[PDB]
Amino acid sequence: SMKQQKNSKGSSDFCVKNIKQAEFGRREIEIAEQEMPALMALRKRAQGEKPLAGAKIVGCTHITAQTAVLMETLGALGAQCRWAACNIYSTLNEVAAALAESGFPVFAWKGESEDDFWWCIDRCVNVEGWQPNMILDDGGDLTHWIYKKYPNMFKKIKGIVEESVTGVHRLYQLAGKLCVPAMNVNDSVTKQKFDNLYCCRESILDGLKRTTDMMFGGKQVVVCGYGEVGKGCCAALKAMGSIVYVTEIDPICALQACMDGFRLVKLNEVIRQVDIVITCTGNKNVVTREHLDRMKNSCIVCNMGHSNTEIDVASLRTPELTWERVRSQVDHVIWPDGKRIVLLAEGRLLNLSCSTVPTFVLSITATTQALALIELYNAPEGRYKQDVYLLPKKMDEYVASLHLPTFDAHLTELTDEQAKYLGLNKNGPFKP
Amino acid sequence: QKNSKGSSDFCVKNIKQAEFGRREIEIAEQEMPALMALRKRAQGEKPLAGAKIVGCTHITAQTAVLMETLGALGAQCRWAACNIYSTLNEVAAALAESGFPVFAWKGESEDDFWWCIDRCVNVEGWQPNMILDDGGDLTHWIYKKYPNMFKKIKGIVEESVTGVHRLYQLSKAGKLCVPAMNVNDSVTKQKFDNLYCCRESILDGLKRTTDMMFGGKQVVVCGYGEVGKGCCAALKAMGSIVYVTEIDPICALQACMDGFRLVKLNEVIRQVDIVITCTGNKNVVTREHLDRMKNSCIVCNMGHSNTEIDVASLRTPELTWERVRSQVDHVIWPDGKRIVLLAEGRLLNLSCSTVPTFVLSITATTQALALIELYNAPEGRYKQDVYLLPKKMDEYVASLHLPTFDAHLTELTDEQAKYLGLNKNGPFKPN
Amino acid sequence: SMKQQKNSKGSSDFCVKNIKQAEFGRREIEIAEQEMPALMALRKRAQGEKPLAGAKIVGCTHITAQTAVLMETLGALGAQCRWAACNIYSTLNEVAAALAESGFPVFAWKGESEDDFWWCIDRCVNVEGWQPNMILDDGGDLTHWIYKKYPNMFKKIKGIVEESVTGVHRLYQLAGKLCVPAMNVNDSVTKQKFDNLYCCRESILDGLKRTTDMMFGGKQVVVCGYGEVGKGCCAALKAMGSIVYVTEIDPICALQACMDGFRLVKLNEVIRQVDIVITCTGNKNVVTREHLDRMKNSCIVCNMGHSNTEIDVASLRTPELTWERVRSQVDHVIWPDGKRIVLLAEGRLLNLSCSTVPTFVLSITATTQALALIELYNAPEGRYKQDVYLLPKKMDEYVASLHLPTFDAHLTELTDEQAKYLGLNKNGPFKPN
Amino acid sequence: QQKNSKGSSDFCVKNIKQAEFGRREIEIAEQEMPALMALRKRAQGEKPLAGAKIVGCTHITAQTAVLMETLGALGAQCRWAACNIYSTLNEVAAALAESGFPVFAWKGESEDDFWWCIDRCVNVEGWQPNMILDDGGDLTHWIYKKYPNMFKKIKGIVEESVTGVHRLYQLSKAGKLCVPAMNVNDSVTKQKFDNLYCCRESILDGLKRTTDMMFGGKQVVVCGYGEVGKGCCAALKAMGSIVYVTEIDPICALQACMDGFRLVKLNEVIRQVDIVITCTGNKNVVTREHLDRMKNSCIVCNMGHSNTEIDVASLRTPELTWERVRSQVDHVIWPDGKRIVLLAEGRLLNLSCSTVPTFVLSITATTQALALIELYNAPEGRYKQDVYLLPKKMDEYVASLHLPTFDAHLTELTDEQAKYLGLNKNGPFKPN
Ligand SMILES: NC(=O)c1ccc[n+]([C@@H]2O[C@H](COP(=O)([O-])OP(=O)(O)OC[C@H]3O[C@@H](n4cnc5c(N)ncnc54)[C@H](O)[C@@H]3O)[C@@H](O)[C@H]2O)c1
Ligand SMILES: NC(=O)c1ccc[n+]([C@@H]2O[C@H](COP(=O)([O-])OP(=O)(O)OC[C@H]3O[C@@H](n4cnc5c(N)ncnc54)[C@H](O)[C@@H]3O)[C@@H](O)[C@H]2O)c1
Numbered sequence A: 001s002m003k004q005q006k007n008s009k010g011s012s013d014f015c016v017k018n019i020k021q022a023e024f025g026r027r028e029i030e031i032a033e034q035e036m037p038a039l040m041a042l043r044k045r046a047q048g049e050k051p052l053a054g055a056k057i058v059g060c061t062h063i064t065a066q067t068a069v070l071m072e073t074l075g076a077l078g079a080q081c082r083w084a085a086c087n088i089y090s091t092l093n094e095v096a097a098a099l100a101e102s103g104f105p106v107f108a109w110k111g112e113s114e115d116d117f118w119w120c121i122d123r124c125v126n127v128e129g130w131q132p133n134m135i136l137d138d139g140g141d142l143t144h145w146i147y148k149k150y151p152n153m154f155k156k157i158k159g160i161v162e163e164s165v166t167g168v169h170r171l172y173q174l175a176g177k178l179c180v181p182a183m184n185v186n187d188s189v190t191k192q193k194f195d196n197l198y199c200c201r202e203s204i205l206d207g208l209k210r211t212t213d214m215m216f217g218g219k220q221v222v223v224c225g226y227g228e229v230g231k232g233c234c235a236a237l238k239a240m241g242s243i244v245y246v247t248e249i250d251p252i253c254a255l256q257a258c259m260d261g262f263r264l265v266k267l268n269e270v271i272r273q274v275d276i277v278i279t280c281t282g283n284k285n286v287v288t289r290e291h292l293d294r295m296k297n298s299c300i301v302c303n304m305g306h307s308n309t310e311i312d313v314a315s316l317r318t319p320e321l322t323w324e325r326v327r328s329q330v331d332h333v334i335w336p337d338g339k340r341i342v343l344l345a346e347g348r349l350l351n352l353s354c355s356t357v358p359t360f361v362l363s364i365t366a367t368t369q370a371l372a373l374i375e376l377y378n379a380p381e382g383r384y385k386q387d388v389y390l391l392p393k394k395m396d397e398y399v400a401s402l403h404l405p406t407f408d409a410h411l412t413e414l415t416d417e418q419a420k421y422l423g424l425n426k427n428g429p430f431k432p
Numbered sequence B: 001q002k003n004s005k006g007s008s009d010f011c012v013k014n015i016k017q018a019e020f021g022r023r024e025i026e027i028a029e030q031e032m033p034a035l036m037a038l039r040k041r042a043q044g045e046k047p048l049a050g051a052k053i054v055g056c057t058h059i060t061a062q063t064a065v066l067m068e069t070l071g072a073l074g075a076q077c078r079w080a081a082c083n084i085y086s087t088l089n090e091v092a093a094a095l096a097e098s099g100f101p102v103f104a105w106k107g108e109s110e111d112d113f114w115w116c117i118d119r120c121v122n123v124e125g126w127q128p129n130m131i132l133d134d135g136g137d138l139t140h141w142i143y144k145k146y147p148n149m150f151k152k153i154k155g156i157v158e159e160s161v162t163g164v165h166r167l168y169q170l171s172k173a174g175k176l177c178v179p180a181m182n183v184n185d186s187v188t189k190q191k192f193d194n195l196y197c198c199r200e201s202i203l204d205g206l207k208r209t210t211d212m213m214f215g216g217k218q219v220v221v222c223g224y225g226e227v228g229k230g231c232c233a234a235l236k237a238m239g240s241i242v243y244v245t246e247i248d249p250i251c252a253l254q255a256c257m258d259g260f261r262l263v264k265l266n267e268v269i270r271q272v273d274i275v276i277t278c279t280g281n282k283n284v285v286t287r288e289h290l291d292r293m294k295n296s297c298i299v300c301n302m303g304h305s306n307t308e309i310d311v312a313s314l315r316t317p318e319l320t321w322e323r324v325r326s327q328v329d330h331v332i333w334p335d336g337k338r339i340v341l342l343a344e345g346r347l348l349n350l351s352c353s354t355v356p357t358f359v360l361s362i363t364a365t366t367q368a369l370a371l372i373e374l375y376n377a378p379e380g381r382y383k384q385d386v387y388l389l390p391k392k393m394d395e396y397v398a399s400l401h402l403p404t405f406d407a408h409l410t411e412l413t414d415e416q417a418k419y420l421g422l423n424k425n426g427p428f429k430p431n
Numbered sequence C: 001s002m003k004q005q006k007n008s009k010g011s012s013d014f015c016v017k018n019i020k021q022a023e024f025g026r027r028e029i030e031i032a033e034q035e036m037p038a039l040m041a042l043r044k045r046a047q048g049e050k051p052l053a054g055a056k057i058v059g060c061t062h063i064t065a066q067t068a069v070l071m072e073t074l075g076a077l078g079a080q081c082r083w084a085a086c087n088i089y090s091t092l093n094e095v096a097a098a099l100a101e102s103g104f105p106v107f108a109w110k111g112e113s114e115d116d117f118w119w120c121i122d123r124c125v126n127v128e129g130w131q132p133n134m135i136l137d138d139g140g141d142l143t144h145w146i147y148k149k150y151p152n153m154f155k156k157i158k159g160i161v162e163e164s165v166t167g168v169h170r171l172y173q174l175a176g177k178l179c180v181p182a183m184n185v186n187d188s189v190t191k192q193k194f195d196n197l198y199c200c201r202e203s204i205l206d207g208l209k210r211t212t213d214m215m216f217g218g219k220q221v222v223v224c225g226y227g228e229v230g231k232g233c234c235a236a237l238k239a240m241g242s243i244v245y246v247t248e249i250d251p252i253c254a255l256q257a258c259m260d261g262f263r264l265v266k267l268n269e270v271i272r273q274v275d276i277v278i279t280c281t282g283n284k285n286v287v288t289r290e291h292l293d294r295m296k297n298s299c300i301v302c303n304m305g306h307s308n309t310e311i312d313v314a315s316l317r318t319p320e321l322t323w324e325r326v327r328s329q330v331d332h333v334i335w336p337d338g339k340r341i342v343l344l345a346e347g348r349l350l351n352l353s354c355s356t357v358p359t360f361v362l363s364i365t366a367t368t369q370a371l372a373l374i375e376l377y378n379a380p381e382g383r384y385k386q387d388v389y390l391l392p393k394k395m396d397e398y399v400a401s402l403h404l405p406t407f408d409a410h411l412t413e414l415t416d417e418q419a420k421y422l423g424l425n426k427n428g429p430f431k432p433n
Numbered sequence D: 001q002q003k004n005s006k007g008s009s010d011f012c013v014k015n016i017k018q019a020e021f022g023r024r025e026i027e028i029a030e031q032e033m034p035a036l037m038a039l040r041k042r043a044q045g046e047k048p049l050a051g052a053k054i055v056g057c058t059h060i061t062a063q064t065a066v067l068m069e070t071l072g073a074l075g076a077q078c079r080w081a082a083c084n085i086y087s088t089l090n091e092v093a094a095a096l097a098e099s100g101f102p103v104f105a106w107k108g109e110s111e112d113d114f115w116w117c118i119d120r121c122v123n124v125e126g127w128q129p130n131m132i133l134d135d136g137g138d139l140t141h142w143i144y145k146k147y148p149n150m151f152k153k154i155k156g157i158v159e160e161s162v163t164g165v166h167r168l169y170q171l172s173k174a175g176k177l178c179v180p181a182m183n184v185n186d187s188v189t190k191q192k193f194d195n196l197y198c199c200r201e202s203i204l205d206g207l208k209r210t211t212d213m214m215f216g217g218k219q220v221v222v223c224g225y226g227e228v229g230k231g232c233c234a235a236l237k238a239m240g241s242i243v244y245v246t247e248i249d250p251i252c253a254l255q256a257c258m259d260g261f262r263l264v265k266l267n268e269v270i271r272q273v274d275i276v277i278t279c280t281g282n283k284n285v286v287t288r289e290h291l292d293r294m295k296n297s298c299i300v301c302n303m304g305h306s307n308t309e310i311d312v313a314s315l316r317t318p319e320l321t322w323e324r325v326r327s328q329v330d331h332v333i334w335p336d337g338k339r340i341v342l343l344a345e346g347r348l349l350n351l352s353c354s355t356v357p358t359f360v361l362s363i364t365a366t367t368q369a370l371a372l373i374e375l376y377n378a379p380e381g382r383y384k385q386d387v388y389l390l391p392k393k394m395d396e397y398v399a400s401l402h403l404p405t406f407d408a409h410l411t412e413l414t415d416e417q418a419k420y421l422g423l424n425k426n427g428p429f430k431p432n
């Protein structure tokens, strides 16, 4: 029983697979620290003034070496933390073990069941003689749990920092029922650059290579949707020598596709000739059963947008069709006449299963979360209110500024005359 | 000084030019199918029937297509030039011949300018109820000289940054008692004006002024907003090596992520072949920078005014200026070192490149739709302030231009529309 | 022993790890067939006429599913084949078994010793009642083995087809020793496009992702050498937002790097600031111990050129440095003060250990090899004498032509007057070799 | 005029008073031709062309002036004529005349003037040439025909033109080439500029000049995917055009595919394209029938050869109406009102509507100077009586001398590396 474990200090206030993995886990955390200089720089700069002294943070995020560097940064700034996984598969057990040995109440392991998942959140949140005043959440599951099961604890929370798209939607559904301030770091300016364009551009190629070993040259590709995600996928494939067609419902984005040098088509016009279909819409039923029926043999289908509904994968579970798992995250769906399509990640986000977020990008996110937590926790009366807010612009600039040394970038400082000219402070914020 | 037909109610150099100008218009019609499509879609239903529009814009074949689009939709119009030199006489003639009270010619004098404006406005038994202006000078004239008529105006559409500024200064004072629609902040218009145009114009302006080859040039672009982004991308695509300066760390981080060294100007000033300012700021390139530049360095401005580069600092008496080609000065130091200054530090594209007709169509169409939007507005909707073009109108501008590219827009199903929380006919995004 | 196995027909004329893997192998081969339509079209078009009837082919290549499709094409055109692996680690055991079960004498398994290697080559080549006519070799080891050990068999070989840079160099010695015609398919025109530029362009990003999970944006990269390989690496990294510096010894290539938008530097000018170093020179000691000492902490170093000597990896085996293997093909080399460098694939070619050749590219090579074998074997006497020849241009065009349907590309035909105007046959060749 | 300052009249130019203005243009050209200036400085007062007596027949531009003065600085004695009756810059010719160069050239020579100028250049009392530099083969022809004894004592001929080189080969096969010639038309550096770098720029520049177009979203078909086609496609693609490619050679067709273009037959796209560009070296690629099928306002131009890639002659018919609307731009109008925009009458667009950068002219002039040095100073037996290619090492030196323009720094092989590669440290580094 994994529940019967103690760390070297005699505590058992945690639940991890194997506490003896701690030393291996601490080595992986040390590695992440060396790859995240900007988070280490924020830590060192900010720790002396202990701006999270009295912070009692409950977190639900991915339990990786990089998340540990964030957690221990929060600790260095004076916080007390409890933590659970936001996903049943993503936990690095050795990291969970290292955190438990160092004294973090963490309730997390790889391969949790649904019941384990909620059990861990409750153990994270409901503990004798300690109540949270801050939430850090990736998905809103932990937030909702406190909401439904501990309404009076929920009312006392000073701040919710939320990282996910769906988590942010749920906070917006809260109908006058949101009674504490929330900070939407999903739409922070520096984050968005990375999360949308830069990451998807790389991860479309990485995931396609991982799943198919394909060559990109001369592939006919259709990308549905031309927002930032679509733009990024289009640019990546075009740079690798693919021929890319674009679909859109918004004429303004459509015109941009045209100006960017792509043919703008209805899916039907190209469905029968394409080698690759990629959904980037945030919409449902973009690729229908009939589209799938019209696809040529060996056409590859994937989703880079949301959920698993952009492609109607459910429509492929009819008795007539045969599925074969040929590789991790890769199914051949086969028709009676032998025609085959290649479906990736069962139509879930390709990058989540088949690529890895660079540590640098995890640093951008972690840094943003840390500053949002500091901001909500230390905020004066009246500033924030029963509503969803954005990170102050100066803090967003600070995230960028902390990461600039990675590139040996040299920022120019405005002179006094230029600052007056533009109506700005020398220290920012530079844009409204 | 007299047309076909009955009318002397116009004024232009020479009305025998009607046939030459009319061919010109007919070509511009072919190069502006979005405006022609707007007539096809809208002229039956006559959305501008009862609009009496006075216009003050550049008198070109492209502008003619717009004016006759306003006609086709119902409007009655009179027009003057917004600039004393820019008129195409032949086009003026041809609009006259078909019966536009047009008051404009090339090489006007200052008084003739206001004379022409006054002839648009005043005017027998015809009181204007709409203004389309590029400059704000027709609007100002009407404001000051005909205050009671001004209060009667249903709508003002102004194209210039400066005209818009003046409209916001009226509103601020409480004196804008008619609605204005700002046509410059629309998503479509900004894209062309800020990125797409600049991408092309920096390259065209540099070729025109210098005959340069781009490959292997060392370039520094000051500022990485939309305009700098565009110039960096264009030059990089032509094989130039581009360095970037910024004061905003978020923009600086983008420049890095896009593949550029992010530097202070002093780090590269002595080695670059080309310096381009895209900042909106003053004294970005100082006298000291100019002194430190190597022989034959090219300096130009893609930002604002003529002050990003401190050109005034180069007018000291020991420096020698030689005009070597239109818009190109060599500024020579006592020791014989030369820099090459383009367009006297003014916007290079304004004097060394040409706006494509397609982009003139985006502008013209936005202006037509704005006029239609104000004129047919319910009494509630617009009153005594500056409004932005509604998003649906910007979507239509874009939609009207898609046939240039053979682009095929997809339509949402009812299920998808409901899923996204949107109307099938848009608007598809906020703002 | 491994050596004590029979196929379902009682033959033990092969040596394979495990014959019961045959059925799984056969399914891998069938997958490869579907992904190599151009080789299957060549097969189907050329089969009936049996252009390789009487051909007795000894091959030494990578034993993958794709190679199987080539081998069975050769069989389908009438050849008799025996096969061995050209590398001790690359054999896919299940494919070797599928082959052995279909009746190919194949001598190959993953993880052979050096003695095993030469033993397999000997078994492939030296067998009572069957002399080879033709050699297909990737590296020259099989060719060398026959030359040295069976010099009378060698004199009787109708044709050598060689695939590899080092194999071709070896053939060129010749020296007066090459008494049979060889065809160099390493330098075929269609092949080269894919082997040099198109492969490296993809490989570099894939291999770096595989080994480091890096992002490319804002990485300062120095690429040594600006031939096709370096060119391909530069374009790929540039397109992903890296800042790329190039080194060259050839001023004509240097000038092209400049025109392509890259700063051209000496390595020491950027060695202290770069995040990634890539060697693409075909030269040795391009990155020396002293360069590695100068590198900043966490700099990534890899080779996309030849062998393992472009970076002087041997210089890092000094007792004050420690190595930690941190992932497959990833070592951290750590200095007394704690500075580290990240070395990939021990300075061997990154793409070979950390990427995969797309099957389409394996198709181009296989089709090329097949046609070279056909040409040599059916050649009039004495079109080919005692030298190294290139694949006929028309065959090279045919390789390209067979693969165009993958892209739905529609080739234009010269009219009769255009053919006359240009001085070209309607069916080519369109350009000289 | 008639005499220079020193009272010589051994020249023939329009007006000797133009010297000062010409000198100024030469000075500007010097600043844009550092490679030639560096050859001058490297001499260190030695005279590597001391005994050379060079007759030259080239375009009389400011760039040519710098070459001629470089040959003089190296110790050559030079006489010169124009290779073309229209191209002479009179001010430059005057400046050369003032400096003591016997130049016989002016703008608007008649055909009789042209040959007289050549005769004045090569036939002078008490001075025979021993070297020829020629762009066209006409000076060479004159000497061969009129002064056959002088011809036989020529030490070397350097020839710049395709046609001049063709003529030298005719003489050679006839057994009549009794002196060494060097073909500097074909060097690897020159090839790359003429075929790829210059065309990449000139197509875009030529299209802007003629039509004021925007490139974004244009549908373009490029016929031919050799070096010129490759360059045109990459330039238009980089500006956001959608580009289709035609080819007869499957190897080139496959490259187009792999580079991210659709590979089509012209007929598949002739009705939809906005721009047609011919880059084939072939005849009747764009036929009368293609022209009839083009959509209204389609722009048509040639980047290949001659004026026959497009069948322009088929449009010179009473049925069709031609209208010159701008320099090098015709609207060709059909009875039904459909219009085509023909550029440069289907001649080479770049030659009428663009400028060769001075850098490219420097590559050419530097090549010529080095070929002259090499031929003049070669030891007995190196160059027999035949056509030779520019040696590789000298092509490398040309390139190398131009690298400082880019602040580019060349690496040098160690002894151990040179040995490993089987190369001399100083080159040549590649075969040919
Ligand atoms: N894979 C990832 O890691 C990742 C990262 C960030 C965002 N996303 C998701 O990707 C989706 C798109 O993100 P974005 O930032 O590009 O959003 P966005 O709204 O800017 O763009 C989506 C585009 O799709 C278009 N669209 C909607 N329905 C369509 C249809 N049926 N056919 C064609 N086009 C249609 C819209 O007009 C819009 O332009 C969102 O759901 C977002 O959450 C994924
Ligand atoms: N040439 C044209 O036709 C054209 C077209 C549109 C806009 N503009 C003008 O171009 C300028 C830039 O426009 P934009 O849309 O890119 O604006 P914006 O988003 O860029 O603001 C300009 C950028 O320059 C940066 N900057 C300010 N001062 C700087 C300094 N001293 N050094 C380095 N960077 C500095 C700012 O941080 C900002 O990122 C504005 O003046 C705008 O009106 C010109």
Ligand SMILES: NC(=O)c1ccc[n+]([C@@H]2O[C@H](COP(=O)([O-])OP(=O)(O)OC[C@H]3O[C@@H](n4cnc5c(N)ncnc54)[C@H](O)[C@@H]3O)[C@@H](O)[C@H]2O)c1
Pocket: C165, C195, C196, C200, C224, C225, C226, C227, C228, C229, C230, C247, C248, C249, C250, C253, C280, C281, C282, C283, C286, C304, C305, C306, C349, C351, D411, D413, D417, D429
């Ligand atoms: N990674 C792969 O799968 C792969 C594929 C094909 C070829 N290759 C190999 O890559 C190497 C390069 O191939 P290529 O086709 O580009 O060859 P190439 O000979 O055309 O290019 C190599 C370049 O390196 C330059 N060079 C030599 N020494 C140098 C040095 N010390 N510093 C800087 N530059 C130097 C040369 O001038 C040359 O231009 C060869 O060994 C080739 O066999 C590798």
Ligand SMILES: NC(=O)c1ccc[n+]([C@@H]2O[C@H](COP(=O)([O-])OP(=O)(O)OC[C@H]3O[C@@H](n4cnc5c(N)ncnc54)[C@H](O)[C@@H]3O)[C@@H](O)[C@H]2O)c1
Pocket: C412, C414, C418, C430, D194, D195, D199, D223, D224, D225, D226, D227, D228, D229, D246, D247, D248, D249, D252, D279, D280, D281, D282, D285, D303, D304, D305, D348, D349, D350
């Ligand atoms: N505009 C210029 O300044 C300039 C510069 C250099 C060369 N050129 C000329 O451009 C032409 C092409 O030069 P290159 O260097 O690209 O030569 P190239 O031989 O490499 O390429 C021409 C290509 O056209 C293809 N082709 C031939 N006929 C065709 C047809 N009917 N349809 C489609 N494709 C066809 C050939 O397969 C070949 O690949 C030549 O005439 C050359 O002399 C012009």
